[model samples]
Target: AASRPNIILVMADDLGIGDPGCYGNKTIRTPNIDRLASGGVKLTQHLAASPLATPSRAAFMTGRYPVRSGMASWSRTGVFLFTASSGGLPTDEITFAKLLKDQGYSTALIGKWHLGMSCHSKTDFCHHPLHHGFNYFYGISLTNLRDCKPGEGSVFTTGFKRLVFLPLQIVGVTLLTLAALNCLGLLHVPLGVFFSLLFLAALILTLFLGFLHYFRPLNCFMMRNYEIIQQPMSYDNLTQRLTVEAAQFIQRNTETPFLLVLSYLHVHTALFSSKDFAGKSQHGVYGDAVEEMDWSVGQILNLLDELRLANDTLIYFTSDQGAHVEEVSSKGEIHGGSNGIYKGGKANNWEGGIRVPGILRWPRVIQAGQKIDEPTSNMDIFPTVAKLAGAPLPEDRIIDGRDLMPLLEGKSQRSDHEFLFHYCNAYLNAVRWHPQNSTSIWKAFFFTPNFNPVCFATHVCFCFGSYVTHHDPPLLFDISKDPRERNPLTPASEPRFYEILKVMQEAADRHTQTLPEVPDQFSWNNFLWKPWLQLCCPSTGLSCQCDRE
Candidate 1:
């Protein structure tokens, strides 16, 4: 394929399937994304490795299902034992970046690396991204806003700029007054009492400063290790910045091919629209965010065109996972992004949760402006990119993902994928849902909500304790006819699907290397120690608690 064409993979974090104009959202003005869709293949049935970011990124990076890669969920510093050395993607796994870099392709990652960072130190997240094979890295180690800020920062910025400066002067005056009052013991007030009052006032003032620190950290913290560029809320500014940086890199590296990953923080939770795009769309900020994200897509495409690399470059655009409707609900009456015509959202194991927007654009290679309905996982990215780069895959290593080159080129309808597994927080409270291979029946596993470990750990088990023991049996849905899973057939109606359940169970067992050996009477709720599972259990299960340790 032209001996390794330059590849630019743009991934949007937490973007919903229906947020983009290409995905059929009428409210958002995504002219750029729509243009890309006009010239590319938009996959209708794409899947994510896990519902969360870290695990999904792990799958995309290593080309292996996260469970197989030991990144089944979000890994905080020490929450899981795997957070230690060789925690994320593993040192053994060969990434697409590594393959491309070795084959004379300069690689750069521009956004989020949520997989396990260093456990011993707070500033060691560089290891994971570096180890997984990126030459130049930017953006964040985890999330943005709160987590990216330095130790001394402020979370909120008052509308008045003068107010911030005035407060400091007021504080200075108050401190001087308190000191003078304490020294004089004003009107029979005991010196100890005055000093004690002054100390309490000073403590309150210090806490106020600390509060500010929480929102906007000091310059040193922001400038330390990773390049923490404040994400401008201006739609034009954000899109312009990404386009400029990407274009600059291309110009500098014109001598050879390069792999540029321009990941965007958009259409995700806490959607922020730039002032230029504020209220410009029907859906408010959410719509503006979508529009901005789409503009970014268009900018990259324009860059390719300007460089005359349009025919020589392979472009891939997709989201980490589907969107969460809960985010919309939390934001008041705003229309939250949802996976179109798919059931459930975000963390659920349903169609909407795991299914995401998968688009590929390659002139003179991939069939343009077509829809491929075959179920594809994000894990396929690693192998496909590596193959495209003409780089040899790692020897003596097993990758759970299948190369999608054949499917992408319209050479084959399907690969040898027998089953696809979906997971949520971690393997501890995993949802064993499998799409039946070339079959109508889809099967899944459901555990008792009462046995969730976090419930007891956080002592929130007392609430709704009665529904714990009810058998939430594994369900089998006729996915062929009922894609939305509106009418799930009982387990008895489909014995063949039930049989497939055993096979899927084995797949899970192999991935996590944990046998489903809980006693018949054993509870399932006592094992989930994650906070996100608690949110999932209230509606998905019973007696759920979220313990953040």
Candidate 2:
């Protein structure tokens, strides 16, 4: 206990639990991941607090639900879509990295940080990784979207047209009506004032159009610390460069205890594969991307072995959430991952959306080739790492995560989690209850996304609005028996259906009572593109350009 172990948290973006070979996938080759599973503990029932990246990652970092941190959104688009968004992980929140950093550990975050970048201005960077416990930060402030890469259609085009253009059109029409009224002498406005109003409206429209045109270059970029390296980053060798940076960080901090979060941008939409890995998998571009990510994991593992740090390091691997089932290419090709037997995928309160692969390897402390079937969460990383680092957990607020040290050490058979609440946006869609005395794992869905048959190969249920269906009796499933959630137990099918509902409902009511109203971070005002917060190339005075070193 005198010497603290170094922590390496490797997270994949949108990679499903069933995609990895260690997680029982027959197609994709993930030997490196399989090696970790065989050498460490594999959690079969590991869950993500939210299905979306921003909220899920927030909960993972803070050891609390997204709702508690105000990261959860009430809008239809639950996650952050723009780099210039104002809302992000608040600075006051205590992270495991912050706790460890206080305990004399060096911390770094490399790769995707979709939480946010700034508050009022671009230079402020109030929500940056550096502000939230990390001593070093690199990678994209926003998520890897289709618009970032050429030939991949813009993700913002549709949403922008609806959210921005439509409103501008309305304003334009209103301005025109005012001008007509002034010209007809029905309005008592001065000619100079009327012309000025028209000019201002036209200016606003022009700026909006310009923004739409340059959306990609403005929002998609790679950063090293505080400097923007590439605007509309080249995907060709991005993965390779990130991997190298991670290795270098480890090498430089060899003597000290460090926390390196190697958050991979691969396996997400607008996916890229290096020349060495392209066309090398059975599942098209998505598979190729997965293989490339696997190779990256192999590189880090090999480096650890070379440095003789494998024995003193704790490596944890997982995806933020399940894969985006609706992800498809313009050519009608499936670009998303398979969720095995779980129903639905990302953005829904289904097992396919929340159940993720959890693998932890600590050669010195944890035994090899162990499997834990009890429920766990990505949030568990907070307390687990904090305890290992000899840091105390923050007791001022609620910390949903529990220390997994006892379970990993084989001292405990049951998980600390009795009830795991599932949310889609700010709404509680479902809940999972694991009884202590019983072997039964029951799940109740208060609402669910309305499935579309046409979108069978693409699109999970929508997060909100008319696309979702609320249940009167609520759907009940015994997940231990029906992992697929195909059979919903009723009073006639199961004797404890009503009993389970009563218990889950009461728990949910209690949970809701504890939740104070926090402003939705994903609302239109927060999600809208703000020009002042846009990251631009300072040298060129342009909104977008590459300056890769």
Candidate 3:
């Protein structure tokens, strides 16, 4: 424990616990991940701070809830959609990487960084990975959305499309009407000529806006450090290239202690696979993408072994959240991962949405073939890594994560977390309680997703709007007995229902008092598409198009 070891954190995008073989999935092969579990600690009840990418990843980076960092949203759209968005992880927030770097460790992030990229303008990357304590960053700053792919249908709602295009259409119509009135002698002073000039200008403006929206060169791009290497990145060999970059980084920084985060873009929407893995899975493209990601994991693990860095490195594996159950292809094929027996999936407070696979390997320190069933969280990585690296935890603000070294070392049977608060955006949705000297884990849901029977094919629930049911007394469930959350405990059935609610409410009240009012990063003002903030290749004449390869 005295020696500082290298850390390699590999996170998959929207991967469910049910998809991996080590977590009891017999279908999809994940031998490398299974090997990792066999060689280290596998946490069965590991949890995420949030269910969405932006907030969840934000919590993992900083040891606090997204709300504390202004990354959590009150809006229905909880994640960042555009790279041009000004909202991003604040520069003041302390990340574990920053702490380690301060203590003289090399740090690099080599994959997806869905957290915002800039603040005031496109060139000013206040929220970039480099700005947030990472020594080097290489990958997409936004996300892998449907718009990134050509054949995939748009993910935008009808209302949203109307909001963007209606203003332009009105301008065109008004110009034409004025021209008609001028030609009919209703107006004087060459109003007809002026209208023609105005119409031509509007046409060019509309065309440029249309090109920016439909083409999406600036929206979907690849960056190496601060330079845009590829505009509208070619997904054909993206996984392989990312893997290569990670390998190169490891080889380059083996002399010094380093932290490397390989955030995979696989298994998300607009899913892609290399030529060798395209049609090689028993399932569809989704399965192929998962398998390809597994291969990349294997490559990293193999490189660690070949370089003799396996025993000295602490490798952690997890997903940002559970599978996105609502994801469906343009052809109506299911593109999301399965959450196994757990109720609900991403974007809601449920076991399936928050409980993800947690695997840790450190051959020199941790014991092998151990399984931890106690509740843990993604945020725990911060304190755990910081402690091991001799980096001091930030004392100014509250940190929700606890050091897991005691639990990981089998020194403590109980987790530091007795009660974990669950939030959907800025709203508290549920709470999980693990009483001392008891095996029972109780969960209370103040709100749950309203599953639509008419949308049976999807078999998913909406996160907000009319599709959610709010409870007055809150729905209580003994997850220890009922992991599926099928039966809700009532006062008639359980004697302690009210008692439990009272205690939980008191805890929630205390937690709320600690939170100061912060601006919602996901608000419309921060999320709206800004043309000036859009990353473009000026050499390519405002059209973002380039390929380093």
Candidate 4:
């Protein structure tokens, strides 16, 4: 208990490897991240379990593939669409925070928790951070959308998903017109048709109203544990505020072991750059968000130094996934992030999507100024922190994450990840295999999205349908040499191409076999705009407005 170091996990939302200066970005100014990377063990091949937020974050928290816990959807979005969404990271599943909390650590999450909020009722908050494990939670339950901030335009419009309700609205309007004609005796209609039309019209109209008020008022709000502190949250210096809260949590719990997951909302949609960092970077608004996030990182790092807790705290810096490369503003300014030399960006199982920055720093424990090119996953953090905290992991479930302490402390040069699966939603898109006692790192792409640089057809990449191309032979590549995946190795080019594909397929089959059937939290019904579960302040349900923060 006395030797257990405080754990600080800092995760940036929608951040990419190319966004930071240390990761080889020439335009973005990220000195703080540069300093962190210089002083830490940088993982050159850190992969996210999933490319999108909900599934990626779910895997990060539970240290298992999100599909195992039903966080990955086969038929719908990969993340929570609303703050009031009835689906979330199931309470039955355990998180690293829960184990640490049981071990007497003051667990806190002070930023984004896009997993979910309520279950049966709005106040239930069954899927919230607090419900999952954290003793305190101060952040937005949902993600930062384009509508969260003013004048950014809708993310849906920019992505061509604005017509999501077009078909439904059309059906509702036609039904209403028929009802009007029938009421005036201009047309004859069945009793069932008349009553059904009335019911469907009311339901669609109600949903439309909710959808119209989705942005600032309902979907965007700051929460403190169970209460809503700021409805329609003000994005002014949010990064600074979140950083200060993280520091305060550390200061207040310095005597004992504390686990603070500072889940940042930076570098996400409707990018918010503080006044100090605005218009100061080379990459426009995207770079502005990067700089602001970097500045906030430095603030937290400085606070650790000031408090003399640098040596006593195990600090980690990473992102949930890569950037949305297709993101562009209404004025045609590029708002998407850079993924460095990697092939693709977010929403696909490409190198740019699952691969994220993983840095760990401890004054004397971990060797400083070291970069390891070993393949690692974000899920590895769970067992590493749990082992360090002296907390026992749940043996009832399959904990896919291997403890990284041995690797971080230079005890071993090799990672235990012989096989890793890459998923786009519920579909397995790719698989990675690092053969034992071999220098070759094999990767097989079962399917790939139809894109050169970005998915222009639907803005962001999709998993199934005509959006992706299924590779029958399975495109194989040795990532040890070709990290960008520019060339696909054939049987003629590589002697063991068929052998590699067979192994990859075998691993994927075994992985899916272990995934037990569970209710999908990312389903369409759970993702729909539910007005009853909406989280708003007491004053006005329509406005959802409050400035308590």
lDDT of each: 0.59, 0.85, 0.83, 0.84
TM-score, model 3 to reference: 0.90
Candidate 1 whole-model C-alpha lDDT, 0 to 1: 0.59
Worst window of 10 by summed lDDT in candidate 4: 155-164
- Model 2 clashing residue pairs (backbone): 326-459
Per candidate, the number of residue pairs that clash is 23, 1, 0, 0
TM-score of 2: 0.91
lDDT tens digits, residue span 411-480, model 2: 8999988888998878889999998787788898888887766334224456565787888677888888
Show where candidate 1 strays beyond 4 Å.
73-93, 116-128, 145-212, 215-236, 328-336, 428-441, 447-473, 491-497, 510-549
Better of 1 and 4 by lDDT: 4
For model 2, the local distance difference test gives 0.85
RMSD of each: 12.0, 4.3, 4.3, 3.9
For this target, which candidate reaches the highest lDDT against the unseen true structure? 2
**TM-score-based ranking:** 4, 2, 3, 1
> What does the lDDT read for residue 468 in candidate 3?
71
Stretches of model 4 off by over 4 angstroms after superposition: 158-210, 452-454
Which window of 10 residues has the lowest lDDT sum in candidate 1?
A: 215-224
lDDT ranking from best candidate downward: 2, 4, 3, 1
